[PDB]
Amino acid sequence: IIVEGDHPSGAGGFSAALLARGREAVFLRDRADILSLRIQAAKSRQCKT
Amino acid sequence: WAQGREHVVGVLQAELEQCQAAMKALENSVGGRKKLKEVMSFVDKARKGEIIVEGDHPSGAGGFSAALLARGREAVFLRDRADILSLRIQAAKSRQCKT
Structure with a gap:
C-alpha cells in the first residue's frame, strides 16, 4: 500500500x-526480535567455541 | 438606462460562468x-x-x-471575484438599479 x-x-x-x-511500535518490534534472536544466539552451543 | 440594464445582466453573468467553471x-x-x-x-x-x-x-x-x-491562493482569488460578480448581478437586477 x-x-x-x-x-x-x-x-x-x-x-x-x-x-x-504504530511506526514506533514496529521499530520496537524489529530491534526487540533482533535482540532476542541475538541473545539466544550468544547463549547457543554454536557459539561455545 | 434600461438598455444598459438589460445588457449588463448578460455581459456580467458571462464573466461569472467562465469564473465558476x-x-x-x-x-x-x-x-x-x-x-x-x-x-x-x-x-x-x-x-x-x-x-x-x-x-x-x-x-x-x-x-x-x-x-x-x-x-489554494488561486482558489481564494476565484472565490472572492465570483462572490463579487454574483452580488453585482443581483444588484443589477435589484429594484434600486432600475431607476
Missing part, C-alpha cells in the same frame, strides 16, 4: 497519531 | 472538494493574523506541498 500527503489528518483506516504510534 | 474544475483537479476547502482554509488563516509562514517559497506548511499552496 502507499499514501500521499493531501490530508495530514487521516491516512488509511487509522488516525494520524495512531499511525505515529 | 474554472473554480469547480479547480476542485476536481486538486482532488476532493473538501480538500481544496482545507487549503483555502489554511490560506485564509495565513492571510489573517492566525498563522504565519515566513516564506516566499513555502514547500510544506501544515502538510501541503509547494504546488498545493499555489492552488
Whole structure:
C-alpha cells in the first residue's frame, strides 16, 4: 500500500497519531526480535567455541 | 438606462460562468472538494493574523506541498471575484438599479 500527503489528518483506516504510534511500535518490534534472536544466539552451543 | 440594464445582466453573468467553471474544475483537479476547502482554509488563516509562514517559497506548511499552496491562493482569488460578480448581478437586477 502507499499514501500521499493531501490530508495530514487521516491516512488509511487509522488516525494520524495512531499511525505515529504504530511506526514506533514496529521499530520496537524489529530491534526487540533482533535482540532476542541475538541473545539466544550468544547463549547457543554454536557459539561455545 | 434600461438598455444598459438589460445588457449588463448578460455581459456580467458571462464573466461569472467562465469564473465558476474554472473554480469547480479547480476542485476536481486538486482532488476532493473538501480538500481544496482545507487549503483555502489554511490560506485564509495565513492571510489573517492566525498563522504565519515566513516564506516566499513555502514547500510544506501544515502538510501541503509547494504546488498545493499555489492552488489554494488561486482558489481564494476565484472565490472572492465570483462572490463579487454574483452580488453585482443581483444588484443589477435589484429594484434600486432600475431607476
